[PDB]
């Protein structure tokens, strides 16, 4: 019976069920045990919880794909901003300037091309903004030799930027790593995501422990006052019935 209570209390943390309830109502306890699998740990229906977990997995996959692209996009924007700032400080080499101008122009053309191509359905009849077609924008691209050069150079710059960003993530999470060589930092970066997941898991475990301890504390706070009252009742009996009455009569005689 104690096992049934523990099981039901762990799964149905909201139910205030005492041992007296299950002792007086044995068939009711069976019903609760049968209900526990049908009810998820959070009080929701098991089917709906399963559906929710499936839908969450799907979202995580899509998000992973989106994030991959988003990281690259952001890095490129950051790179462009950095090169722009250096261009204004007069510290940019002529090659860097050409690269910066070429890359900025390629991205801009691409962004604007898309503004025009509302992937909508060919309607052979849709009026473009300002009457511009995709081809009108492609003409504003730098010469094909410069575009290929910019794309080849970008790969090396992107990997360096990815490295710099990873090192920054690591440096913030583990500032002690800033005193370590690039090889050791690269090794630690390869574990960074797993370390963060572990820390998150640790937090979840500590929260569960907290809830358990809290449940125990509440039980003890329920039993303690009753025990004090029983002691008080015994002392009252000794004082009123024995000392003030029985013993006082004896002493007089």
């Amino acid at each position: 019976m104690a096992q049934t209570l523990q099981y039901v209390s762990s799964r149905l943390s909201m139910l205030q069920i005492d041992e007296e309830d299950l002792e007086r109502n044995a068939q009711f306890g069976k019903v609760l045990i049968e209900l526990c699998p049908l009810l998820g740990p959070n009080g929701g229906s098991a089917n709906l919880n399963r559906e929710l977990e499936e839908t969450r997995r799907e979202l995580l996959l899509q998000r992973k794909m989106w994030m991959r692209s988003e990281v690259i996009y952001q890095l490129v924007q950051e790179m462009l901003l950095d090169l722009q700032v250096r261009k204004l400080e007069g510290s940019l080499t002529e090659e860097e300037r050409k690269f910066q101008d070429g890359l900025q122009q390629c991205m801009l053309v691409s962004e604007c091309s898309r503004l025009l191509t509302a992937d909508s359905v060919p309607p052979s009849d849709s009026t473009s903004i300002l009457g511009l077609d995709k081809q009108d924008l492609l003409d504003l691209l730098p010469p094909n030799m410069l575009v290929l050069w910019v794309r080849d150079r970008l790969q090396k710059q992107l990997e360096e930027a990815l490295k710099k960003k990873c090192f920054t993530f690591l440096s913030f999470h583990q500032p002690e790593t800033d005193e370590e060589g690039d090889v050791l930092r690269a090794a630690k970066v390869l574990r960074l995501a797993s370390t963060l997941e572990d820390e998150k898991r640790r937090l979840q475990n500590e929260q569960e422990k907290h809830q358990e301890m809290r449940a125990l504390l509440e039980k003890q706070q329920e039993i303690y006052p009753h025990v004090l009252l029983r002691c008080l009742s015994l002392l009252r009996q000794a004082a009123s019935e024995l000392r003030l009455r029985a013993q006082s009569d004896i002493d007089r005689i």
Binding site: L12, M14, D21, R24, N25, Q27, F28, E34, L38, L39, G43, G44, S45, L48, L52, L59, Q62, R63, K64, W66, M67, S69, E70, I72, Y73, V76, C106, S110, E111, R114, L154, L158, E159, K163, C166, F172, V189, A193, L196, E199, K200, R202, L203, E206, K209, H210, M213, R214, L216, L217, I223, Y224, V227, R230, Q237, A238, L242, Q247, I250, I253
Partner: protein, 172 residues
């Protein structure tokens, strides 16, 4: 009582489906517990349905945006942005996986920094709170043990005292 009873029976029928409802002791207390449980389940089922539908919508929206960004980058940077070196891909995966682990809106430092700080602060805060609660549990357990010992000692002393009083009463 008749309305709550109807709600419980309907709810149990829904939960157990085609399986015959198991016989249980129908008393005021069992009905109250079942009723609270039924209300809680119904309210949670509603919340979970709304969350599940929203996540489906969000999954579609994220997919659409992913396609957009991929196309933008392919057209702007060429197919070569996807041909990163093994180490480059590893770095990219680690950033992505770190961001997913912290449930971030984006890969910016403005998002990563506060997330890491919050995770660290929450972990310490909860660990301290658990230590404090452990001390309180130990302290109360001691108080409870002392009180229980006292209760037994008082029961003994009272019995002895009652015997002694009876003996003296006989002498008197």
């Amino acid at each position: 009582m008749d309305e709550k009873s109807t709600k419980i029976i309907m709810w149990l029928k829904k939960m157990f489906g085609d399986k015959p409802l198991p016989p249980y002791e129908v008393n005021t207390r069992t009905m109250e517990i079942l009723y609270q449980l039924a209300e809680w389940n119904e309210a949670r089922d509603k919340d979970l349905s709304l969350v599940t539908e929203d996540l489906k919508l969000k999954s579609a929206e994220v997919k659409a945006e992913a396609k957009y960004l991929q196309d933008l980058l392919t057209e702007g940077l060429g197919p070569s942005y996807t041909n990163l070196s093994r180490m480059g891909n590893n770095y990219l995966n680690q950033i992505v996986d770190s961001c997913l682990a912290l449930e971030l809106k984006n890969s910016s430092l403005s998002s990563y920094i506060p997330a890491v700080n919050d995770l660290s602060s929450e972990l310490v805060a909860i660990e301290l709170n658990n230590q404090e609660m452990e001390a309180e549990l130990t302290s109360l357990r001691k108080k409870l043990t002392e009180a229980l010992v006292l209760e037994k000692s008082l029961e003994r002393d009272l019995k002895k005292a009652e015997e002694q009083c009876n003996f003296e009463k006989a002498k008197v």
